[PDB]
């Protein structure tokens, strides 16, 4: 019923082979819409969704100058880290940030996100009360007391309750017909063969959006729970997604096993079987 | 849109 907006940062020191690289990507739901990369050759926020292309040039200046600013800010932050952790200069490290907001279905705030991470480890986190922080290690505590006294808390909250949800509602309406229109997965079940006194069925989910989906699937049943075999929800490439459950069952059983196929695109949710 | 503080730093 709801929606989300998430910007992601990736700062990556790399010494000898550069000054550090800084990348920013912006999603709405599972739709990538804005990209920034300080490599550039002449850098600026670039439009990757069609509904964002239709914006003022003054929108793009704001957004570039933000990430151009953040280029330097993080090159600093990567080095302030080295001091906190006493780390060698030759080492290559990574800072990762994610911030954003959830709406949803009426059109308010639900919760806020603002989360930083160092070398793939939780560093600092903005709590769900949007006024206090979580310090992971003794190094983050520096960087907490910095923001505590600088009253950084409120300027997020003001933004996350304001411009975050404001802009999101704008993005949604502007590209409603791709973003607010869930697509059902085209489902089928294939036979594989096997053993022969033992088979593998395979419940296919294809060509759907968003990535959220559940495939897991029966006999009487529950079932399975456990066999399984589930596979990582992979991207098709056309802004649609894919997935299967197996499973492995005895041969000639066999129409016992029923599949099971929850998506927000559907009403039902469906129930499939081997056909043939 | 994005939000830049700016003085938020490690």
């Amino acid at each position, epitope marked *: 019923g709801s929606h989300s907006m998430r910007y992601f940062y990736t700062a990556m020191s790399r010494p000898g082979r550069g000054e550090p690289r800084f990348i920013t990507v912006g999603y709405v739901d599972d739709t990538l819409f804005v990209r920034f990369d300080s490599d550039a050759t002449s850098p600026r926020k670039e439009p990757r969704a069609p509904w964002i292309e239709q914006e003022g040039p003054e929108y793009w200046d704001r957004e570039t*100058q*933000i990430s*151009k*600013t953040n*280029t*330097q*800010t993080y*090159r*600093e932050n990567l080095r302030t880290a080295l001091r906190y952790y006493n780390q060698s200069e030759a080492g290559s490290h990574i800072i990762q940030r994610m911030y954003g907001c959830d709406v949803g279905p009426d059109g308010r705030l639900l919760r806020g996100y603002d989360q930083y991470a160092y070398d793939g480890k939780d560093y600092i986190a903005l709590n769900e009360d949007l006024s206090s922080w979580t310090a992971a290690d003794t190094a983050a505590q520096i960087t907490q007391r*910095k923001w505590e*006294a*600088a*009253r950084v808390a*409120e*300027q997020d909250r*003001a*933004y996350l*309750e*304001g*411009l975050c949800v*404001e802009s999101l509602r704008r993005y949604l309406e502007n590209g409603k017909e791709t973003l607010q229109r869930a697509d059902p997965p085209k489902t089928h079940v294939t036979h594989h063969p096997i053993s022969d006194h033992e088979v593998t069925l395979r419940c296919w989910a294809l060509g759907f959006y968003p990535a959220e989906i559940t495939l897991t699937w029966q006999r009487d049943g529950e079932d399975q729970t456990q066999d399984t075999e589930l596979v990582e929800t992979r991207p098709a490439g056309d802004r649609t997604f894919q997935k299967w459950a197996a499973v492995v069952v005895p041969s000639g059983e066999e129409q016992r096993y029923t599949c099971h196929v929850q998506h927000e695109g559907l009403p039902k949710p469906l129930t499939l079987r081997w056909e043939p | 849109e994005e*939000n*830049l*503080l*700016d*003085f938020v*730093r490690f």
Partner: T-cell receptor
Amino acid sequence: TGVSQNPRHKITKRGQNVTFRCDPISEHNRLYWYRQTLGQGPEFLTYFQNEAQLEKSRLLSDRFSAERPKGSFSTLEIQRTEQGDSAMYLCASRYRDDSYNEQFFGPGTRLTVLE
Amino acid sequence: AKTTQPTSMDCAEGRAANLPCNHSTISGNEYVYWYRQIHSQGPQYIIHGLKNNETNEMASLIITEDRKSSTLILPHATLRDTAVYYCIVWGGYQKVTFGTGTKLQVIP
């Protein structure tokens, strides 16, 4: 009094060159340039972070060129001086935290271009 | 624009003194900032904040808290305080746009 500038004043004929300078407090991250005609507030010119020129307004003619190579001092150069360039050229800086937006200004180079 | 101030303005040493500003859009992630330029030099900072309340050595600052029309107090006004005052909105990262602004005269 942190920020210092060179020189305090300058005077020149028309189609002439002239370059100013701003030495901010070391360990100041950001450095700003402003111009101020007597009567108005300071108008924004350019803004540097470390050694990079992040923003610059349409007030910057091509004739103007700010530069900050080592990310310490900054040189502001005017190519073909006009009578309209005549103004106070201020230069402020900010500490490298800070927190808040506390800009520390200098004495200002005083340009007066004459016929 | 964003930043209507009285072009000038008197006061008496020393109560008041009571130095308004109208910022009648400002969305809520934008700070309200006040600077002062004492004639011969060349601005300093005085106070922000945020959308709040708030109150330091130079300066109090009362926001509407509906965000609407802030007021610098300068609490016991003196001759030294006579200067040009600028009321500017900062949204983070952007450039500052000093207005015109308010010239306060304090007379004994």
